[PDB]
């Protein structure tokens, strides 16, 4: 009375004989950082997502010591997920998200990229969305888009009392 599947994600198949690569699916890689990208366990009661969120295959290693792991389904919520929803609606492309594995955005280390940028440069993931800072060093190897929220090296102050 239980279902098992050989492949956790559904592979896409060539329909008949048509020379058209399925360009409308793009493995998008994200990074866990609230509130832009936040992680929720699948609702154990109904085994689904609430509609404002999106499915995402988070790869959890089996144990802190064991290197083995599974791409367990997980439910992705936030602001970047919503803007990705609107972007997918307007551009009309499907997608199969999966979270990062190295845990960081990515910084140059011995001429090697890591993290989100590392997984995007090697063309293992076409588009990358989340809380990513536009930077000069990153613009060299990766192509960015028009920013939607500003940022910088800002300062904050404790709110002083009235006088």
């Amino acid at each position, epitope marked *: 009375q239980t279902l098992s599947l050989r*492949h*956790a*994600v559904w592979p896409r198949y060539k329909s008949f004989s048509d020379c058209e*690569p399925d360009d409308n699916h793009l*493995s998008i890689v994200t990074l866990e950082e609230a509130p832009f990208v936040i992680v929720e366990d699948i609702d154990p009661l109904t085994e689904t997502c609430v509609r404002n969120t999106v499915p995402c295959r988070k*790869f959890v*290693k089996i144990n802190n010591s064991t*290197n*083995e*792991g*599974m*791409n367990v389904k997980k439910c992705c919520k936030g602001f970047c997920i919503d803007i990705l929803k609107k972007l997918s609606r307007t551009v009309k492309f499907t997608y199969d998200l*999966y979270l990062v*594995t190295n845990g960081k955005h990515g910084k140059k280390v*011995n*001429n*090697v*990229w890591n993290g989100m940028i*590392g997984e995007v*440069v*090697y*063309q*293992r*993931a076409v588009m990358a969305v989340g809380s990513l800072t536009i930077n000069e060093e990153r613009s*060299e*190897v990766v192509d960015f888009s028009v920013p939607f929220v500003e940022t910088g090296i800002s300062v904050m102050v404790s709110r002083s009392n009235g006088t």
Partner: antibody, heavy 118, light 108 residues
Framework: QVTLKESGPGILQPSQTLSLTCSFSGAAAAAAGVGVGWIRQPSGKGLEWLAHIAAAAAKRYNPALKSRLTISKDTSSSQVFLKIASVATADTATYYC??????????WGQGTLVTVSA | DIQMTQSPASLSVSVGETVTITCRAAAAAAAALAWYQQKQGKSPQLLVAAAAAAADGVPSRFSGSGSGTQYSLKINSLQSEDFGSYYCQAAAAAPWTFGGGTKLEIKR
């Protein structure tokens, strides 16, 4: 330890399918990173790219041969099945299954020869 | 797809001296290059990753230098285990293409 072993017939007629395979040990095919790829070495010649898969279950192919290449992984036995149908006589050379860590440089095995001709 | 034309196939040096070998590719933003050393009758193995990180078990004198398009390998003193071919690949584009190489032998 990290052992790579291949399996495939030493000869085959053209216009058929070859189902060679490789098993990798010393780690798992789903070991959070390092995967398995395949590389082709024509005899007395350079090399050409075939395919690779990582632990995260992502597969990439060679665009020139996006017609007949098929590949799958079995983490239970820690191995990789290959399926290459409609072979051509120009395939008379060796093959190399490789440990395919996330860097662009995979780590190679012993290699296996295939001879397809009349 | 990226073409990648290697160093001239006619390169060889006597045992125990310096040599430099570089393979030339497209001048786009491409530094994720991999360097291999090839054994006749055996499997080719790594020499340097990312054009600067030498692999494990690699002795010192295979210095991998260069940038841009010119990515060179420099040998202080050629020895017996250094004999073989030298291959190079670039990972910038979607198709990952290897190099041609060059055989090394005593120059007498």
């Amino acid at each position: 330890q990290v052992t790579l072993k291949e399996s495939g017939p030493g000869i085959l007629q053209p216009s058929q399918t070859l189902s060679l395979t490789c098993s990798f040990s010393g780690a798992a095919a789903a070991a959070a990173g390092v995967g398995v790829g395949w590389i082709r070495q024509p005899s007395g010649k350079g090399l050409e790219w075939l395919a690779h898969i990582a632990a995260a279950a992502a597969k990439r192919y060679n665009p020139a041969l996006k017609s007949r290449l098929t590949i799958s992984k079995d983490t239970s036995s820690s191995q990789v099945f290959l399926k290459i149908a409609s072979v051509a006589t120009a395939d008379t050379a060796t093959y190399y299954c490789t440990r395919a860590a996330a860097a662009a440089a995979p780590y190679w095995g012993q290699g296996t020869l295939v001879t397809v001709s009349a | 797809d990226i073409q990648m034309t290697q160093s001239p196939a006619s390169l060889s040096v006597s045992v125990g001296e310096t040599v430099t070998i570089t393979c030339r590719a497209a001048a786009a933003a491409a530094a994720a290059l991999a360097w291999y050393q090839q054994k006749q009758g055996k499997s080719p193995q790594l020499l340097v990753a990312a054009a600067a990180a030498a692999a494990d078990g690699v002795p010192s004198r295979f210095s991998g230098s260069g940038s841009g398009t010119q990515y060179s390998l420099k040998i202080n003193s050629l020895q017996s285990e250094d004999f073989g071919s030298y291959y190079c690949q670039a990972a910038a584009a979607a198709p990952w293409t290897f190099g041609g190489g060059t055989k090394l032998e005593i120059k007498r």
